[PDB]
């Protein structure tokens, strides 16, 4: 079978980004030893090791949706993957408010129409299990108390 | 005019899913980073990224050899799923301004970049040249506004929408990591477009519409025909629980309705518990199956069911912002049926920027 | 009392001006400095929280009762919507 490739964006500190960029544009396999990525079983934490120097990483959710588009003639572009995550290196914390481009900054706060967390469904599933495992349930919409 | 990849026009399941559950409809076009169970990345620990520069230039030199061996004209290259990898070719990125657009391309579909250039009054030097796309001189503005004299505007143009794009240079810190089961791979990016508000050219159907139910029935029929084509036994035969694995929300009465014509169930003897193909039935050819369902209809259906989920999760203003209403409003405004209030609540920005596509008399 | 050219021209100019503004906003390479003020909704129209009493049996022999108060109007809506639907499923 075929599995859709999973592309994400890696953001590095600027000096480390310059060393990684120089090693990528060089093209040797020396970069392969120099740059490693360890993703922790949290799923939202990691180390990126540039030249064997550890950097602390967080995999965050991006507010917009990006799409990689490949081409052979620079006139027709074929969509290859959807990018929604970024492993910035240096829950609410794992959500990025800004977009990658310069015009998109504070997009989630200003350029996004109010949208719901769809979280609440999981919380309701937790309450329903407790109700069904009980015997007697008493409910009242309340006031200030 | 738009020629999608052969995985896209044949509606392969990895790229065009048969069924999307609720947690997969909430993560529509935002696929999370999945953990592998088997493979090299499934073992926990540090993993080296691998620089592909020799792979990119080897594949580009090989494609140029293929093009010059075929007479030197323009060629069609995306014939396999392995052609749609990010490991080769010139990648650009495309960011969207809206959170949830009314229409959005699936993986494997093609789009074009058109540079609309309105000449200056009288003498003009020529279109400011651009790295990507082809230039066209537009007297009649494609979008809602009109171009200034001497203004070039790039745009994504395909069958789904048409949207103004704006080339920005990438940040100096961001690279692109393509992870697969075997390892990590890194490219740099230099070009990233920002896509403005889309002008929809395809109408998203409504829920329980006639076009909606027709697309569901035709998609199930195309999947059944392609399972019959994939069958190796001579009286081609399929199993029902393959279709029940693909479409699990379907009642089995509808699947048996699709299999009633073109197949019959063998209970006993040979081919038992199989749905063999009827001997008088001619299985349709590849071009007929391609003419049954279009990929843009699948994108419109996916937009409808994703918006159905988002509205359902959020308990009339929101209903107006649903893509069937906004696509109907914009296409009706383009024929001149009706006008749109350009300031309203269907505004995907939430501020004065951007349009709202809801009908006004 | 125009019912024709006035409406059409007004719509056209709002379209062109809005488009121009959008074009100016997106192609800006100006750096933007790093919550936007919004109306704050009350704990629902009624300003009423939800409290649930649960009766359960512990290991050996016990009958403890748990009173749990849900102050989130979002959890409230989804909870009681299901309860009202169930009141009608029988």
Curated annotation (Swiss-Prot), chain A:
Component of the TFIID basal transcription factor complex, composed of TATA-box-binding protein TBP, and a number of TBP-associated factors (TAFs), including TAF1, TAF2, TAF3, TAF4, TAF5, TAF6, TAF7, TAF8, TAF9, TAF10, TAF11, TAF12 and TAF13. Part of a TFIID-containing RNA polymerase II pre-initiation complex that is composed of TBP and at least GTF2A1, GTF2A2, GTF2E1, GTF2E2, GTF2F1, GTF2H2, GTF2H3, GTF2H4, GTF2H5, GTF2B, TCEA1, ERCC2, ERCC3, TAF1, TAF2, TAF3, TAF4, TAF5, TAF6, TAF7, TAF8, TAF9, TAF10, TAF11, TAF12 and TAF13. Interacts with TAF1; the interaction is direct. This is Transcription initiation factor TFIID subunit 7. Ubiquitous. The modification Phosphoserine is found at residue 129. The chain holds residues 9 to 187 of 349 of the full protein. The TFIID basal transcription factor complex plays a major role in the initiation of RNA polymerase II (Pol II)-dependent transcription. TFIID recognizes and binds promoters with or without a TATA box via its subunit TBP, a TATA-box-binding protein, and promotes assembly of the pre-initiation complex (PIC). The TFIID complex consists of TBP and TBP-associated factors (TAFs), including TAF1, TAF2, TAF3, TAF4, TAF5, TAF6, TAF7, TAF8, TAF9, TAF10, TAF11, TAF12 and TAF13. TAF7 forms a promoter DNA binding subcomplex of TFIID, together with TAF1 and TAF2. It is found in: Nucleus. Overexpression of TAF7 in HeLa cells inhibits cyclin D1 and cyclin A gene transcription and causes the cells to accumulate in early S phase. In contrast, depletion of TAF7 from TFIID complexes by siRNAs increases histone H3 acetylation at both cyclin promoters and stimulates cyclins CCND1 and CCNA gene transcription. Phosphorylated by CIITA. Ubiquitinated by TRIM26; leading to proteasomal degradation.
Swiss-Prot record, chain B:
Phosphorylated by casein kinase II in vitro. Changing residue 104 to I: In a lung bronchoalveolar carcinoma sample; somatic mutation. Disulfide bonds: none annotated. It comes from the Eukaryota. It is found in: Nucleus. Changing residue 134 to Q: 25% decrease in histone acetylation. The TFIID basal transcription factor complex plays a major role in the initiation of RNA polymerase II (Pol II)-dependent transcription. TFIID recognizes and binds promoters with or without a TATA box via its subunit TBP, a TATA-box-binding protein, and promotes assembly of the pre-initiation complex (PIC). The TFIID complex consists of TBP and TBP-associated factors (TAFs), including TAF1, TAF2, TAF3, TAF4, TAF5, TAF6, TAF7, TAF8, TAF9, TAF10, TAF11, TAF12 and TAF13. TAF1 is the largest component and core scaffold of the TFIID complex, involved in nucleating complex assembly. Belongs to the TAF1 family. It is linked to Dystonia 3, torsion, X-linked: An X-linked dystonia-parkinsonism disorder. Dystonia is defined by the presence of sustained involuntary muscle contractions, often leading to abnormal postures. DYT3 is characterized by severe progressive torsion dystonia followed by parkinsonism. It has a well-defined pathology of extensive neuronal loss and mosaic gliosis in the striatum (caudate nucleus and putamen) which appears to resemble that in Huntington disease. Component of the TFIID basal transcription factor complex, composed of TATA-box-binding protein TBP, and a number of TBP-associated factors (TAFs), including TAF1, TAF2, TAF3, TAF4, TAF5, TAF6, TAF7, TAF8, TAF9, TAF10, TAF11, TAF12 and TAF13. Interacts with TAF7; the interaction is direct. TAF1, when part of the TFIID complex, interacts with C-terminus of TP53. (Microbial infection) Interacts with SV40 Large T antigen.
UniProtKB/Swiss-Prot annotation, chain C:
It is found in: Nucleus. It comes from the Eukaryota. Coiled coil: none annotated. Signal peptide: none annotated. Phosphorylated by casein kinase II in vitro. It is linked to Dystonia 3, torsion, X-linked: An X-linked dystonia-parkinsonism disorder. Dystonia is defined by the presence of sustained involuntary muscle contractions, often leading to abnormal postures. DYT3 is characterized by severe progressive torsion dystonia followed by parkinsonism. It has a well-defined pathology of extensive neuronal loss and mosaic gliosis in the striatum (caudate nucleus and putamen) which appears to resemble that in Huntington disease. The Bromo domain mediates interaction with histones that have acetylated lysine residues at specific positions. The second domain also recognizes and binds histones that are butyrylated and crotonylated. Belongs to the TAF1 family. Component of the TFIID basal transcription factor complex, composed of TATA-box-binding protein TBP, and a number of TBP-associated factors (TAFs), including TAF1, TAF2, TAF3, TAF4, TAF5, TAF6, TAF7, TAF8, TAF9, TAF10, TAF11, TAF12 and TAF13. Interacts with TAF7; the interaction is direct. TAF1, when part of the TFIID complex, interacts with C-terminus of TP53. This is Transcription initiation factor TFIID subunit 1. The gene is TAF1. The chain holds residues 1073 to 1226 of 1893 of the full protein.
């Amino acid at each position: 079978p075929h599995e859709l490739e999973s592309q994400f964006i890696l953001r590095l500190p600027p000096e480390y980004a310059s060393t990684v960029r120089r090693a990528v544009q060089s093209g040797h396999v020396n970069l392969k030893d120099r740059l490693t990525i360890e993703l922790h079983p949290d799923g939202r934490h990691g180390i990126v090791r540039v030249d064997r120097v550890p950097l602390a990483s967080k995999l965050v959710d991006l507010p917009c949706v990006m799409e990689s588009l490949k081409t052979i003639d620079k006139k027709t572009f074929y969509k290859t993957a959807d990018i929604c995550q970024m492993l910035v290196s240096t829950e609410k914390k794992f959500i990025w408010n800004h977009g990658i481009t310069l015009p998109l900054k504070n997009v989630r706060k200003r350029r996004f129409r109010k949208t719901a967390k769809k979280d609440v469904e999981k919380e309701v599933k937790r309450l329903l299990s407790t109700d069904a495992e009980a015997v007697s349930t008493r409910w009242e919409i309340i006031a200030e108390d | 005019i738009i020629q999608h990849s052969i995985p896209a026009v044949e509606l392969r399941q990895p790229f065009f899913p048969t069924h999307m559950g609720p947690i997969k409809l909430r993560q529509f076009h935002r696929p999370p980073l999945k953990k592998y169970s088997f493979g090299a990345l499934s073992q926990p620990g540090p993993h080296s990224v691998q620089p592909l520069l020799k792979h990119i230039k080897k594949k580009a030199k090989m494609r140029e050899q293929e093009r010059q061996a075929s007479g030197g004209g323009e060629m069609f290259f995306m014939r396999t799923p392995q052609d749609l990898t990010g490991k080769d070719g010139d990648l650009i990125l495309a960011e969207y301004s809206e959170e949830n657009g009314p229409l959005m391309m699936q993986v494997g579909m093609a789009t074009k970049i058109k540079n609309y250039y309105k000449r200056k009054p009288g003498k003009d030097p020529g279109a400011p040249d651009c790295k990507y796309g082809e230039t066209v001189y537009c007297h009649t503005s494609p979008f809602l506004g009109s171009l200034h004299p001497g203004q070039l505007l790039q745009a994504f143009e395909n069958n789904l929408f048409r949207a103004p794009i704006y080339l920005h240079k990438m940040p100096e810190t961001d690279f692109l990591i393509i992870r697969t089961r075997q390892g990590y791979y890194i490219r740099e990016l230099v070009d990233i477009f920002v896509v403005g508000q889309q002008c929809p050219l395809f109408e998203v159907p409504g829920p329980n519409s006639k076009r909606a139910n027709t697309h569901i029935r035709d998609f199930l029929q195309v999947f059944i025909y392609r399972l019959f084509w994939k069958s190796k036994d001579r009286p081609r035969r399929i199993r029902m629980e393959d279709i029940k694995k693909a479409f699990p929300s379907h009642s089995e009465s509808s699947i048996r309705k699709r299999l009633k014509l073109c197949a019959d169930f063998k209970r006993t003897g040979m081919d038992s518990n199989w749905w063999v193909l009827k001997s008088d039935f001619r299985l349709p050819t590849e071009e007929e199956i391609r003419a049954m369902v279009s990929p843009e209809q699948c994108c419109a259906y996916y937009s409808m069911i994703a918006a159905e989920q988002r509205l359902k999760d959020a308990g009339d203003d929101e209903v107006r912002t649903a893509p069937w209403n906004t696509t109907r409003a914009f296409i009706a405004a383009m024929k001149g049926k009706c006008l749109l209030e350009v300031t309203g609540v269907a505004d995907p920005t939430g501020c004065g920027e951007g349009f709202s596509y809801v009908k006004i008399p | 009392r125009f019912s024709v050219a006035e409406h059409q021209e007004r719509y056209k100019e709002e379209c062109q001006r809005i488009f121009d503004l959008q074009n100016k906003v997106l192609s800006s390479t100006e750096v933007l400095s790093t919550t936007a003020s919004v109306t704050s909704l009350n704990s629902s129209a009624t300003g009423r929280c939800l409290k649930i009493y649960r009766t359960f049996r512990d290991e050996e022999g016990k009958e403890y009762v748990r009173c749990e108060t849900v102050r989130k109007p979002a959890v409230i809506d989804a909870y009681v919507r299901i309860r009202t639907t169930k009141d009608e499923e029988f």
